[PDB]
Design a protein around this ligand. Structure first.
Ligand SMILES: Cn1ncc2ccc(CN3C[C@H](C(N)=O)CCC3=O)cc21
Ligand SMILES: [Zn+2]
Length: 139
Protein backbone atom coordinates (compact mmCIF):
# COMPACT_ATOMS: atom_id res chain seq x y z
CA UNK A 1 0.00 0.00 0.00
CA UNK A 2 0.98 3.68 -0.33
CA UNK A 3 -0.07 7.02 -1.80
CA UNK A 4 1.34 10.37 -3.00
CA UNK A 5 -0.21 13.55 -1.57
CA UNK A 6 0.32 16.73 -3.64
CA UNK A 7 -1.87 19.84 -3.47
CA UNK A 8 -5.53 18.76 -3.34
CA UNK A 9 -4.71 15.37 -4.98
CA UNK A 10 -4.09 11.79 -3.75
CA UNK A 11 -2.31 9.42 -6.24
CA UNK A 12 -2.77 5.69 -5.60
CA UNK A 13 -2.44 2.38 -7.54
CA UNK A 14 -5.76 2.08 -9.43
CA UNK A 15 -6.17 -1.56 -8.24
CA UNK A 16 -5.96 -0.38 -4.57
CA UNK A 17 -8.30 2.65 -4.90
CA UNK A 18 -11.01 2.77 -2.18
CA UNK A 19 -14.79 3.61 -2.48
CA UNK A 20 -13.88 7.16 -1.28
CA UNK A 21 -11.18 7.47 -4.02
CA UNK A 22 -13.77 6.48 -6.71
CA UNK A 23 -16.43 8.83 -5.20
CA UNK A 24 -13.94 11.78 -5.50
CA UNK A 25 -12.37 10.68 -8.82
CA UNK A 26 -10.28 13.25 -10.78
CA UNK A 27 -8.56 10.94 -13.32
CA UNK A 28 -7.82 7.22 -13.76
CA UNK A 29 -5.99 5.15 -16.40
CA UNK A 30 -6.25 1.34 -16.27
CA UNK A 31 -3.35 1.03 -18.75
CA UNK A 32 -1.08 2.84 -16.22
CA UNK A 33 -2.50 1.29 -12.95
CA UNK A 34 -3.03 4.89 -11.65
CA UNK A 35 -5.96 6.72 -10.07
CA UNK A 36 -6.03 10.30 -8.68
CA UNK A 37 -8.74 11.43 -6.25
CA UNK A 38 -9.39 14.84 -4.63
CA UNK A 39 -8.64 15.68 -0.95
CA UNK A 40 -9.82 18.40 1.48
CA UNK A 41 -6.37 18.76 3.14
CA UNK A 42 -3.34 20.13 1.25
CA UNK A 43 -0.60 17.61 0.47
CA UNK A 44 3.05 18.65 0.53
CA UNK A 45 4.86 15.92 -1.48
CA UNK A 46 7.12 17.29 -4.25
CA UNK A 47 6.83 15.70 -7.76
CA UNK A 48 10.07 15.33 -9.73
CA UNK A 49 10.15 17.00 -13.20
CA UNK A 50 13.21 15.34 -14.76
CA UNK A 51 14.62 12.39 -16.74
CA UNK A 52 16.54 10.73 -13.80
CA UNK A 53 17.19 7.03 -14.15
CA UNK A 54 18.60 6.60 -10.58
CA UNK A 55 16.66 6.87 -7.32
CA UNK A 56 15.61 5.12 -4.09
CA UNK A 57 12.39 3.14 -3.44
CA UNK A 58 10.62 1.96 -0.31
CA UNK A 59 10.14 -1.83 -0.09
CA UNK A 60 7.53 -2.69 2.62
CA UNK A 61 8.24 -6.48 2.39
CA UNK A 62 11.81 -5.69 3.64
CA UNK A 63 11.08 -2.50 5.76
CA UNK A 64 13.96 -0.97 3.75
CA UNK A 65 14.77 1.59 1.08
CA UNK A 66 16.91 0.44 -1.86
CA UNK A 67 18.94 2.54 -4.36
CA UNK A 68 18.27 1.50 -8.01
CA UNK A 69 18.90 2.35 -11.64
CA UNK A 70 15.61 2.28 -13.62
CA UNK A 71 14.52 2.40 -17.27
CA UNK A 72 12.68 5.36 -18.95
CA UNK A 73 8.82 5.17 -18.89
CA UNK A 74 7.71 2.73 -21.60
CA UNK A 75 4.99 0.23 -22.81
CA UNK A 76 5.85 -3.12 -21.15
CA UNK A 77 4.05 -6.50 -21.25
CA UNK A 78 2.69 -7.39 -17.75
CA UNK A 79 1.45 -10.90 -16.89
CA UNK A 80 -2.11 -11.47 -15.66
CA UNK A 81 -2.96 -11.04 -11.93
CA UNK A 82 -6.42 -10.85 -10.02
CA UNK A 83 -6.62 -7.29 -10.86
CA UNK A 84 -5.89 -7.30 -14.63
CA UNK A 85 -5.72 -9.69 -17.59
CA UNK A 86 -2.29 -9.91 -19.38
CA UNK A 87 -1.75 -6.57 -21.16
CA UNK A 88 0.75 -3.84 -21.99
CA UNK A 89 1.08 -1.36 -19.08
CA UNK A 90 2.15 2.11 -20.24
CA UNK A 91 4.47 4.67 -18.56
CA UNK A 92 6.16 1.78 -16.64
CA UNK A 93 9.83 1.75 -15.51
CA UNK A 94 11.75 -1.36 -14.45
CA UNK A 95 14.68 -1.85 -12.05
CA UNK A 96 16.55 -4.85 -10.69
CA UNK A 97 15.29 -5.29 -7.15
CA UNK A 98 12.94 -7.06 -4.79
CA UNK A 99 9.18 -6.55 -4.62
CA UNK A 100 6.02 -8.50 -3.79
CA UNK A 101 2.36 -7.57 -4.72
CA UNK A 102 1.79 -5.97 -1.27
CA UNK A 103 4.68 -3.56 -2.01
CA UNK A 104 2.48 -1.62 -4.52
CA UNK A 105 2.31 2.01 -3.53
CA UNK A 106 5.91 2.26 -2.28
CA UNK A 107 7.43 5.52 -3.51
CA UNK A 108 10.43 5.82 -5.85
CA UNK A 109 12.21 9.17 -5.37
CA UNK A 110 15.17 10.89 -7.01
CA UNK A 111 17.07 14.09 -5.96
CA UNK A 112 14.21 16.16 -7.53
CA UNK A 113 11.28 14.52 -5.70
CA UNK A 114 8.70 11.77 -6.23
CA UNK A 115 9.15 9.80 -9.50
CA UNK A 116 6.49 7.09 -9.22
CA UNK A 117 5.05 4.20 -7.21
CA UNK A 118 5.59 0.41 -7.18
CA UNK A 119 3.06 -1.25 -9.53
CA UNK A 120 4.51 -4.49 -11.02
CA UNK A 121 7.20 -7.10 -10.44
CA UNK A 122 8.47 -10.63 -10.29
CA UNK A 123 11.65 -12.48 -11.37
CA UNK A 124 13.82 -9.96 -9.43
CA UNK A 125 12.53 -6.97 -11.43
CA UNK A 126 10.41 -4.23 -9.83
CA UNK A 127 8.19 -1.95 -11.97
CA UNK A 128 7.15 1.63 -11.13
CA UNK A 129 4.25 3.62 -12.53
CA UNK A 130 5.74 7.02 -13.53
CA UNK A 131 3.97 10.23 -12.40
CA UNK A 132 6.51 12.85 -13.68
CA UNK A 133 4.51 13.57 -16.87
CA UNK A 134 1.32 14.57 -14.86
CA UNK A 135 2.11 18.27 -14.84
CA UNK A 136 -1.42 19.16 -13.66
CA UNK A 137 -0.76 17.57 -10.20
CA UNK A 138 1.07 20.88 -9.34
CA UNK A 139 -1.70 23.34 -10.21
C1 LIG B 1 4.62 -5.32 -7.22
N1 LIG B 1 4.90 -6.72 -7.51
N2 LIG B 1 6.05 -7.29 -7.04
C2 LIG B 1 6.00 -8.56 -7.37
C3 LIG B 1 4.80 -8.86 -8.08
C4 LIG B 1 4.21 -9.99 -8.64
C5 LIG B 1 2.97 -9.89 -9.25
C6 LIG B 1 2.29 -8.68 -9.33
C7 LIG B 1 0.91 -8.63 -9.94
N3 LIG B 1 0.25 -7.32 -9.88
C8 LIG B 1 0.54 -6.45 -11.02
C9 LIG B 1 -0.62 -5.48 -11.27
C10 LIG B 1 -0.44 -4.58 -12.48
N4 LIG B 1 0.00 -3.35 -12.26
O1 LIG B 1 -0.66 -5.00 -13.62
C11 LIG B 1 -0.89 -4.72 -9.97
C12 LIG B 1 -1.29 -5.71 -8.87
C13 LIG B 1 -0.56 -7.03 -8.84
O2 LIG B 1 -0.73 -7.80 -7.90
C14 LIG B 1 2.88 -7.54 -8.77
C15 LIG B 1 4.12 -7.63 -8.15
ZN1 LIG C 1 15.19 13.51 -10.92
Amino acid sequence: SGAIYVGNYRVVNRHLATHNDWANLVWEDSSRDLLVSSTTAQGCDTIARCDCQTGVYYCSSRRKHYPVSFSKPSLIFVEASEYYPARYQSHLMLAVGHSEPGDCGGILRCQHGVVGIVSTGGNGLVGFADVRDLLWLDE
